[PDB]
Amino acid sequence: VLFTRCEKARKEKLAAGYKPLVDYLIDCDTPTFLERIEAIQEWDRSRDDLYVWIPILDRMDGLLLKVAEKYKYKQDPKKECEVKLVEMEAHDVDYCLKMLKFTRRLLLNTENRFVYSSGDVLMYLLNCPNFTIKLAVMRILAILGERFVIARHNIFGDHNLRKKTLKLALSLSSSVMDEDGEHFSLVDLYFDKKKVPQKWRKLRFTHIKKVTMTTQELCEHSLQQIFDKGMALLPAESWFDFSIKASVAKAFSDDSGENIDLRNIIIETKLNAIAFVNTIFSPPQVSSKLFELDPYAFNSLTDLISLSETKIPKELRTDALFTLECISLKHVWCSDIIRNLGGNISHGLLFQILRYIAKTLREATDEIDEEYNVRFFYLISNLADVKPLHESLFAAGLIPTLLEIVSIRNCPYKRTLASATHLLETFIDNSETTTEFIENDGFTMLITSVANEIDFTLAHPETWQPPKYSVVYYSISFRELAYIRSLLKLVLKLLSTDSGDRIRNLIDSPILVSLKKILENKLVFGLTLITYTLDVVQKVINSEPTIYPVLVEAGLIPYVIDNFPKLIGPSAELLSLLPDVVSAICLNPEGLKQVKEKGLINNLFDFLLDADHARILTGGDRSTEYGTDIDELARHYPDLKANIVEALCNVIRKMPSTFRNEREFLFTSPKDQKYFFHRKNEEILTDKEEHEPAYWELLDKGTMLDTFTSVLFGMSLGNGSFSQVPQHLEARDFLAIIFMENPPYEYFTSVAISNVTEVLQYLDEKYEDYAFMDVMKVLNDQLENLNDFLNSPNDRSFFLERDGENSVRSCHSKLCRLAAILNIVTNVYIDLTTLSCKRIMQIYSYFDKRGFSLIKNLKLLFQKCALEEMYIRQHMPDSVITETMPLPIVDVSGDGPPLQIYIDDPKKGDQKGKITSVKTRNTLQMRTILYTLQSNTAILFRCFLRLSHSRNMDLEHKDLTTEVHIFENVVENVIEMLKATELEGHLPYILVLLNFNTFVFTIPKASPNSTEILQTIPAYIFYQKGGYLLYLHIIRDLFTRMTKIKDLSSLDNINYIDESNGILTLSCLINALTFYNKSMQTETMENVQSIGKYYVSIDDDYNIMKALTVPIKVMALAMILDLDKSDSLFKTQSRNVPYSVFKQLLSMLKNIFTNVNIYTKELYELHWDLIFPPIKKISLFEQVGIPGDVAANYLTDTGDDLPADNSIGLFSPEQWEKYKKLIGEDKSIYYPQPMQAQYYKGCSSKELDELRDTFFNDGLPSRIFTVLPFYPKLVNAFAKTLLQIFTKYDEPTEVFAGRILDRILETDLDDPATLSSLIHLFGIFLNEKYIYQKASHLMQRFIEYLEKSLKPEHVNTPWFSKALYVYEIILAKSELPHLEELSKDVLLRYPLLSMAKVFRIPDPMKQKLFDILIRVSDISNFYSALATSRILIFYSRDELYANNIARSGILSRLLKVIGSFQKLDKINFLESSFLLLTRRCFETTENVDALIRAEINRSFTARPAVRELTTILEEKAHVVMRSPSQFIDVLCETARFHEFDDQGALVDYSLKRFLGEKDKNTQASSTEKSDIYERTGIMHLLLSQLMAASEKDWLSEPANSSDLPENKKAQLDPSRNPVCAYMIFLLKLLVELVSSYNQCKFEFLTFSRRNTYAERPRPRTTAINFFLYRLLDKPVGTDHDKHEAKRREVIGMLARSVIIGFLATVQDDRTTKTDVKLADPHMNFIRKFAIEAIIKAIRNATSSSKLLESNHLKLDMWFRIITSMVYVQAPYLRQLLDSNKVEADQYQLCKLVIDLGLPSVITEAMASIDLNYPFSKKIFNVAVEALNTISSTRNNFSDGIILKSTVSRWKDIFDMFYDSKTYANCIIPTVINRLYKVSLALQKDLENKREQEKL
């Protein structure tokens, strides 16, 4: 029963209505219980909820779950031993059917049926030999399935049940064959026309097996005998089937006087099973599994349901009819149902039944199956949803026929007449149906019947049969109240049509006076009839206001107005019309005047003071839309805004008197009378109640307020009648309904505190001075009443100290109010995202006037609520702690105040709902309140410390002296909290405090990630008061605590803060050293202005943010040095410091040694009373003889000059001589004094420089090699810190690099880890340009070392990767374009620039290392493979090196690594590196050249003389870097460059395309015999790996996931199967290679598992066949493995793309020659060979239809391939091949298919398909789809898978290696050195000269 808290509260109150009902059924022995159950039968009331019946269901479920065990029918899904076939005892059936027969009568007359939970005993009961039990259990299952299909528990997936249902449906067949008849349909059973076929009359059952019990063996054995005999033979897995079949045979065995009864039961069960199957199963699944086996279902169903037949069983009629009500729920079956019934003709069966229904109703001969009629109407109303069927029934005479029923007079069968009237309402939607109803005098009989019913009902009060077991407001039989409700609800739907006519028909009728009889008798007709009666009155006035006088004469409106309060009751639909009923009465000015008088607006709000009425309205959408309608009633009639307000206020002013102390929320435990635990080892009194207590929505107030604040939230939208409430309502009166005096613990979570924060946020933007100062006074006064909780001992829990008293109850109640107040405050008024200027001024005024008493209390609240969540967790068993963890609260996302100290990994999942108790609820209520009292108390302090600095406003002197005065009081309180407790025993508290300090003192990250910037001025005051001297004494105390821990290694692998002293002692040491590194980085610090802003009596005006760092570093560095003194670090090899604590101590040094351009000598204390116009002086002047504002000017002009020794121009003699007596001899006080030294002797920049020197000269950088080997996890930090140190103390870093290298050249290789770290550091240093230029000698020596030391056998050591990393750093630079120098005075002026030099490795060294790296062996290290790939991508730039790489076999060894580490996350990088290296192994000078040319010319177009060269070489950097020589060469044969400059130097670098310039000299080439030659062998390896990965399970889901099995991953993750990821990678690689490079195809074409040599290798087809047949040959298919289907489709798309890419033509220089349609014989040869296989594949798949059944899924793809081929479009493709070139692809591929003869090879496949095979539908459909495309294309001519084109991969390489697009600029001299003398000079001088020479 997963309900919302509101729905649960509504239903728990609704269930209180059926207390007499439950008590009447649950207070009986048991024989009586069944006796009462068997007397319910017919409902005389509305459809009850199932929730209120649940207790009866449980008493019944238990009774069944005990009789199930009696016969062992109880099954255990997992054990297929099956329950032994044992016929249930006769008497014991009645006991089991009196209950299962009532579960139908209950589940039909009940809604919210989804709460049913007994669908487990049903499975256990289904495995029962007896069918009657099975009949009932299947009827109930069918009803439950109907409910489910209508709704769009878990048992709808249980495959065992699915099979039981499928077999019971495929029970005795509907009709098969008889020698003297067509098929003996089931209906024939009851006609003595055909005799039952003898096949049914005997038994023959299989499981290899065959058991037969021919008749005369089924006629003597009793059912139990047969059931046992068979099971003895057959396995238990097939006992159910034997039971069903033997029962069928024995039932048909003889035409006895009883056997027929059992046949009836079996057929009924079959029908109900069909219905259930139709519900759970999918339509295609239902057709394939159920109808395929039995296609005669419908043809039989539509024969049984015929009331005219008096021989068919009355129960079979309903069951067959019920099956159709389920089947029709899917529109696909509706058409056939109507066709079978005859719903298209007017004389069919569907209309012959309707006439018999009327015949019976017109005579009442006890042959009226009112359930039959009702369900027939449901069937028709389901068939009527299919618009084609709606029209078919309309034209067949539905309405003319249905109008013969509802026109019956004085009928007593109102169950059928009410359903017919609802069917009529549903049917009539068009104008055709409406005008056909009206035309046949339909609307005149409707209103005549309504009046007749109403008139009779009132006159005959002896026919009233109201319910006696529900709470209702009528006195008439529900039958009559429903018939009238149906007539009225159709009278309403017929009024939205041409109401001008319908309203005139109403007037000339007795309807109007018969409606005043409904209104003048409400206790008779109830409220659902008054809701429909008042809806006509309001819908009749709003469409014809001229009728208002008539409605007044009849006396309706006069009665509506004079009895309005009498007409309101707890009915949701009634209450949603009252605003619309007043908006119609008000259309008449006299009506409006009467509404103003008589208080018809006071009645639209007064009902909200009643819990019963508020609960019905809910408090959600219906409640809000009742407010937005009141506002409309104010708009249309602005004359009522004076009454909607005088009523609203009178409601808000009266609620506080309706509040009562209903419940108590804290309960003492029964045993000890203590609310809370008192030890970690108490005994838990487990209960079965709800773990989370809910009291709000179950209260008379939680509904009243939840509804009222929803009305208010609706009415707040836009200005209206609510906007004027403040002008009439005091703020206090509005805050007496929100801040109740005893709310529950969940009040601040309610919707009354989520709507009233939208009402108060709307009264804020407008009335900014209305509530604020009152909300704050309420806060301050509530916190002032907790003067005994806040001001209590800090060494014990205030609550535990008085457990069992009332103060525990009378204090938690105060904190519950304080929790809603603070949630209001921090959500409405003080929000860092909403702080406006006026809000800030309001805060300043509040603190000026009321005083700083609120902050001294907010500190005490956070301090005591953190001491009570620690003293209480030190007395609670760990299970309780993980149960009562309060974080999972609405809205709140943690991420801030009080840190949660878990006991179990939160990332694991949930842990609540495994234990409960009185105590486990009394502490979940406490720890939840305590959590928001601290969470909201920390957001308040964050805002109290930002204030103006958020808006950056300009402030006055009194508006600054206060801000710096709030900052001074929030910080002296943050310190008082830290200075109070002691770490010993309160560590969990010091961890909350140190996260609170780091939260208040930081601003949110103003970016998606960003970081928490520091609040500089609060931090400055913090230091001023000694806030960092405290963090030192905390850190020198948490460092001896971290040094006496044993297992410091485990701490480095934690991801959840536990309550272990170990981890706690570490967490405080990172939340301190982190706050201490944040106040030292000018990037994490807020850039406040200079000190002069505040003081003027200073010496040096410094930037406060910059000047604060120095004092901080002078202490941090001193503490560090002291630490090194005490044998802790930079010494010892035992790693005395965890990884994270050392990460901070290293960023503490990069900052300690960063220099900020400011030399501070002394820092002045920031004091609010000493800011300029010093108040400490101005206030004193005020004390005697105020020079008001003149004193201000006096100090402003004298520059803060204290009147020296006499009154001069002011200070009258009496004013003086007093200023003398005052002004004590301490003139210092009135000036900003300098800060004192902290920790160190002097915290000035001089001392910072003097300590950094001492640290520097102690050779700690020379002591760095003594630590580095042990902390390899962080060497970049070790580098940045060291580089910063050296930069600060300018020193040649090259010297330190040499020192590192010398260590390497003497480090034994037996130290892999020291060598790894050392090489990583060396590589990191070389990565900086300012040191690279000075390391040529170092890099040469490194190359040497590598050559002499490195051996291929080291590939698996962890230092190999770093050695290759440094080598790559050297290489990338070494392979930059060879810089050329300007020559022969190229001029151009503008001195070029010249770029930095680059170390150039001697060529032999490259070769000697390459010959070492290609020779490596099997790699078991991911990082070795990654580094080798990155290095080899460089050598592959040269074809000669790529040849060696490919022939080496290195690629196989890398693919092995790729395959092995397919689960490792970073496998993507290795995948990409391998892809790039392989792509580079196929690229050749020719292909390169072609693409290089195609790139530059495409740059020259742009399509926005042009193209400044400095852009081409900065946008095509990858293009140049692939082959700079070729780029230069091609660039010189065009782009001959313009703008020679006036003198001819060359001013700018813009180039001219110069198409044809330099002539068109060109060479020729033929290719062939090279691609044919190539046989690189890479494709052999890739295909071998894929063809080997196919065998392994690339479909099976891996073992399991443990946290998101039914979550996250679900099927979302298709790469979990390790082989699939390997397969996916290989397939993507294959697509890219086969679609990019021509040589790749010839390898795919001639692939062969045995790599035998054959010049011009034979074009084998092993690969193509593998892709077509074998690759997707994994049978599986069965079951419903979502993951397997996903993987199959993914591989299908990838394989299809592979073939299309294999058939496409590679993009090349021939871009604009797309016009050419010549083709290529080789490309042709590829396509003929490929298609000719698919043809040859189809002509095998087709013949021998036997074969077709197997190759029926392969044929579904071979046809899709044909579609993609001729529509040149495949999944995941089209990123690679030019769109210009796919004109011949489609065209030529078509032309080929036509020529090949494959518009007809498809047809011959269709001409050989026995259509009986179900898949034929699919095969035929796609086969046409391919033909459609082929013809379509012919006419014109008369997911996480990223694939990228070749050049895009060059870009990838460039991105990985060169981190600068500038580098390509290096060749600029070359082009300048090249064409210019012979290009620019020549062309230009000639061009301008010849044209000039022309004239």
Please write out the topology.
Layout: H1 5-14, H2 19-26, H3 31-37, E1 48-49, H4 54-70, H5 90-100, H6 102-108, E2 110-111, H7 121-126, H8 131-151, H9 159-169, E3 204-205, E4 211-212, H10 223-233, H11 239-253, H12 259-280, H13 283-291, H14 297-304, H15 314-327, H16 331-341, H17 349-361, H18 370-383, H19 387-396, H20 398-402, H21 414-427, H22 431-439, H23 442-459, H24 478-493, H25 499-507, H26 511-519, H27 522-525, H28 528-541, H29 548-553, H30 556-562, H31 572-575, H32 578-585, H33 589-596, H34 611-617, H35 621-636, H36 641-652, H37 700-715, H38 731-735, H39 752-759, H40 762-766, H41 772-785, H42 807-829, H43 837-850, H44 855-867, H45 878-883, H46 918-946, H47 948-951, H48 958-961, H49 963-980, H50 987-1000, E5 1002-1003, E6 1013-1014, H51 1016-1024, H52 1027-1038, H53 1061-1078, H54 1104-1125, H55 1139-1152, H56 1175-1183, H57 1190-1198, H58 1245-1257, H59 1276-1288, H60 1293-1304, H61 1314-1326, H62 1329-1332, H63 1336-1349, H64 1358-1374, H65 1403-1413, H66 1422-1435, H67 1439-1448, H68 1450-1460, H69 1467-1482, H70 1485-1499, E7 1506-1508, H71 1509-1515, H72 1517-1522, H73 1524-1532, ...
Parallel strand pairs: 1-2
Antiparallel strand pairs: 3-4, 5-6, 7-8
Helix pairs in contact: 5-8, 6-8, 8-12, 9-12, 10-11, 11-12, 12-15, 14-16, 15-18, 18-21, 21-24, 23-24, 23-26, 24-28, 28-32, 32-35, 34-37, 35-37, 37-39, 39-42, 41-42, 42-46, 44-46, 44-49, 49-51, 50-53, 51-54, 52-53, 52-54, 53-55, 54-55, 54-58, 55-59, 59-61, 60-61, 61-64, 63-65, 64-66, 66-69, 68-69
Keywords: Cell cycle, mRNA transport, Nucleus, Phosphoprotein, rRNA processing, Transcription, Transcription regulation, Transferase, Transport, Ubl conjugation pathway
Organism: Saccharomyces cerevisiae (strain ATCC 204508 / S288c) (Baker's yeast)
EC number: 2.3.2.26
